[PDB]
Write an enzyme that holds these catalytic residues in place. Structure first.
Site, PDB file in Angstrom:
ATOM      1  N   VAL A  54     -32.101 -18.234 -79.864  1.00  0.00           N
ATOM      2  CA  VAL A  54     -30.787 -17.593 -79.922  1.00  0.00           C
ATOM      3  C   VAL A  54     -30.097 -17.923 -81.250  1.00  0.00           C
ATOM      4  O   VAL A  54     -29.750 -19.093 -81.506  1.00  0.00           O
ATOM      5  CB  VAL A  54     -29.893 -18.059 -78.759  1.00  0.00           C
ATOM      6  N   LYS A  61     -23.484 -10.795 -80.270  1.00  0.00           N
ATOM      7  CA  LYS A  61     -23.611  -9.734 -79.279  1.00  0.00           C
ATOM      8  C   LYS A  61     -23.211 -10.254 -77.907  1.00  0.00           C
ATOM      9  O   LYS A  61     -22.662  -9.513 -77.088  1.00  0.00           O
ATOM     10  CB  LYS A  61     -25.032  -9.158 -79.261  1.00  0.00           C
ATOM     11  N   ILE A  95     -49.315   6.052 -74.716  1.00  0.00           N
ATOM     12  CA  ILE A  95     -48.278   6.547 -75.611  1.00  0.00           C
ATOM     13  C   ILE A  95     -47.501   5.370 -76.187  1.00  0.00           C
ATOM     14  O   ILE A  95     -46.660   4.775 -75.504  1.00  0.00           O
ATOM     15  CB  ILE A  95     -47.300   7.506 -74.904  1.00  0.00           C
ATOM     16  N   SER A 169     -51.042 -13.871 -63.517  1.00  0.00           N
ATOM     17  CA  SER A 169     -50.035 -14.488 -62.668  1.00  0.00           C
ATOM     18  C   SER A 169     -50.618 -14.772 -61.286  1.00  0.00           C
ATOM     19  O   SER A 169     -50.188 -15.699 -60.597  1.00  0.00           O
ATOM     20  CB  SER A 169     -48.790 -13.594 -62.567  1.00  0.00           C
ATOM     21  N   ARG A 172     -52.214 -18.200 -60.838  1.00  0.00           N
ATOM     22  CA  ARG A 172     -51.122 -19.167 -60.771  1.00  0.00           C
ATOM     23  C   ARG A 172     -50.403 -19.072 -59.419  1.00  0.00           C
ATOM     24  O   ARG A 172     -49.495 -19.850 -59.130  1.00  0.00           O
ATOM     25  CB  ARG A 172     -50.146 -18.970 -61.940  1.00  0.00           C
ATOM     26  N   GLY A 178     -48.737  -7.213 -62.070  1.00  0.00           N
ATOM     27  CA  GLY A 178     -48.579  -5.893 -62.659  1.00  0.00           C
ATOM     28  C   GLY A 178     -49.878  -5.111 -62.749  1.00  0.00           C
ATOM     29  O   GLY A 178     -49.871  -3.898 -62.968  1.00  0.00           O
ATOM     30  N   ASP A 241     -58.411  -4.513 -65.654  1.00  0.00           N
ATOM     31  CA  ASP A 241     -59.206  -4.807 -66.840  1.00  0.00           C
ATOM     32  C   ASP A 241     -60.351  -5.717 -66.425  1.00  0.00           C
ATOM     33  O   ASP A 241     -60.170  -6.572 -65.555  1.00  0.00           O
ATOM     34  CB  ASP A 241     -58.363  -5.499 -67.916  1.00  0.00           C
TER      35      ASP A 241
END
Ligand code: NA
Ligand code: NA
Length: 317
Positions: A54, A61, A95, A169, A172, A178, A241
DNA sequence: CCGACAGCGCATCAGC
DNA sequence: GCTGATGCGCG
DNA sequence: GTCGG
């Protein structure tokens, strides 16, 4: 601090897809996650400024967000037809920022325009368009388990010297993923060394209609689509994959693709103090001069923990 | 100040 | 046809 | 955009 991290993630996505500035992207991303782990409702830009990742512009912002509830820059971005269209299109697999941009220039802006214009889409893109909705869906754990039992068993049926591990994930122990990431190996494949190790497994998985589409395939990496069988209402299609790794680099492979990303980072850092460098392929010892020697024999994830003198740590942690 | 910030397998393309 | 560059996803 | 040499 969900408001601040959502603002940031938006900034990250705008930099990656529209600006094509991958480093600003990763910087905004790093900043968000760091702020995610912060156990206090941020009150000032300065406050968050203390965090690693940061800096001055983000603290500014954050002040504007806290003060006004909004981010002026983000607002103008969303109001810009070209930026939002390009940003949306990249959500289609195959894309990226270059294709999205090119598509919006010729007035191709929406899912519907793509379907109308499939003549201009490559194979990967068509498939991405096709399963647009399913790809954005999470795979609940119990489905991962189902998917695992199928891959491991079908791999077992081809050649039983095949070793396969589902990482990500999932290893784990996450309740959702995903996509599915599978590492494969075999006693016949090594640094030094077959024609169709990955093929036979990809093929065998098509025989039982688990794998439904191919994004890419080669001697070592397969990227594709799969689906669980249904009784009753059908399952979403999933990204899978499959990596074929040499057997002498498998556990380093397993360690790498099991993450987390932050964890690997600490392992490498620790590995240095002890005089070892660890990548996706090997662990090697460093000379006094910083010169890596030969890769060390690794027969397990723990061997690696052993070398760098670390308490073997279970994937869950 | 100024460069680094992951870079690799595969698909596709540009340029010969 | 051939080689190297680029885009993409992954992370 | 942030970091660090
Ligand atoms: Na500070
Ligand atoms: Na995508």
């Amino acid at each position: 601090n969900g408001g601040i991290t959502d603002m940031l993630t938006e900034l990250a996505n705008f930099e990656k897809n529209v600006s094509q500035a991958i480093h600003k992207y990763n910087a905004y991303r790093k900043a968000a996650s760091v702020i995610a782990k912060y156990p206090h409702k941020i009150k000032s830009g300065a406050e968050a400024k203390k965090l690693p990742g940061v800096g001055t512009k983000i603290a500014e912002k954050i002040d504007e967000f806290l003060a006004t509830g909004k981010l002026r820059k983000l607002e103008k971005i969303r109001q810009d037809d070209t930026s939002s269209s390009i940003n949306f299109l990249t959500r289609v697999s195959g894309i990226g920022p270059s294709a999205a941009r090119k598509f919006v220039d010729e007035g191709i802006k929406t899912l519907e325009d793509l379907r109308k214009n499939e003549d201009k889409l490559n194979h990967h893109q068509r498939i991405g368009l096709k399963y647009f909705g399913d790809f954005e869906k999470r795979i609940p754990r119990e489905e991962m388990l189902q998917m695992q039992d199928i891959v491991l068993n079908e791999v077992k049926k081809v050649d039983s010297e095949y070793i396969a591990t589902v990482c990500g994930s999932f290893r784990r122990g996450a309740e959702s993923s995903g996509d599915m990431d599978v590492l494969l190996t075999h006693p016949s494949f090594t640094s030094e060394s077959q024609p169709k190790l990955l093929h036979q497994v990809v093929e065998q998985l098509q025989k039982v209609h688990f794998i439904t589409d191919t994004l890419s395939k080669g001697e070592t990496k397969f990227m594709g689509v799969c689906q669980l069988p249904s009784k009753e209402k059908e399952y979403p299609h999933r990204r899978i994959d499959i990596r074929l790794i040499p057997k002498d680099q498998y556990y380093c492979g397993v360690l790498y693709f099991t993450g987390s990303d932050i964890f690997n980072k600490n392992m490498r850092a620790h590995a240095l103090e002890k005089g070892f460098t660890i990548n996706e392929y090997t662990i090697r010892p460093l000379g006094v001069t910083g010169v890596a020697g030969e890769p060390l024999p690794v027969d397990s994830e723990k061997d690696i923990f052993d070398y760098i003198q670390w308490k073997y740590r279970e994937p869950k942690d």
